[PDB]
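Hi all, a correction to my earlier message: I attached the wrong file for AaBgIC. Here's the right sequence:
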Amino acid sequence: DFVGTHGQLQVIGNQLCNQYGQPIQLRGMSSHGLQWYPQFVNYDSIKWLRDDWGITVFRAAMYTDSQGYISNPSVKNKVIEAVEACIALGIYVIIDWHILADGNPNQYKEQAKDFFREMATRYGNYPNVIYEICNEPNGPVNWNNHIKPYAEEVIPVIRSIDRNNIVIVGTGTWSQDIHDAANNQLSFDNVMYALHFYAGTHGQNLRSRIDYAMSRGAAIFVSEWGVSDASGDGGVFLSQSDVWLDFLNERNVSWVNWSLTHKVESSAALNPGASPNGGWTDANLSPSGRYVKSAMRKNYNPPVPP
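and the right structure:
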């Protein structure tokens, strides 16, 4: 019962902490698009990731555009299923308003308010829940006059129901521009800024940005990363993945791998034919999957309650 041990999460300075104010790192897996690969998101597969890999957080990627929530709102049911599974299993869950093709978060801001208002009404009293209000802002979309104003409209709605659970806020250039966010941070409490990286693409320059942002007091959550290049394909970069995870582990920065699906691409955790309900043998895991399972509990020492 990981949530039973660590309870309510909170941000102190630049660090995510547990209910006793102890720095804590989460690690886990992201679903792919719930409108495209829902069959891998269920109580069975999440329990297996808990028991066999040792994840402590699971991310439900609910695309808004690209046949997702806006055009097919029944995908909301997969979010409800993932959240209720994680409450039953005692792990944390990220509810991800997964913008991408809709690179400006303000495009569906009214629908985001209504959606997060219902999620907080349903689950805001559970410590498991983490809100991620805009996956990857991208394009000609900036912190100071697009993302920050969006966040200042959505978060008061969440906080009007759920006073304390963590909100992760995406940053510019597909959640790379955490230095803009760090130089002009949100006033709310218990907020973190998202940093996304891919080991085939991003290197020491982006790692330096994490140190710059944390030095200004900003808390950073790696809510999506892959072993591939940033297209999600292009082979697997395990040596580079090792430097990134060691760097993040050293700094207690939480991380969530992309993605739990059998799509035929380097970042996918599962080979075609892997069961939708977990129990995967090594033959069922892709190279990325085998590596991420190995990394999930490497050098993982969560705090001991007082």
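Sorry for the mix-up. The beta strands are 10-12, 15-17, 27-31, 57-63, 92-98, 129-132, 167-169, 191-198, 220-226, 255-260.
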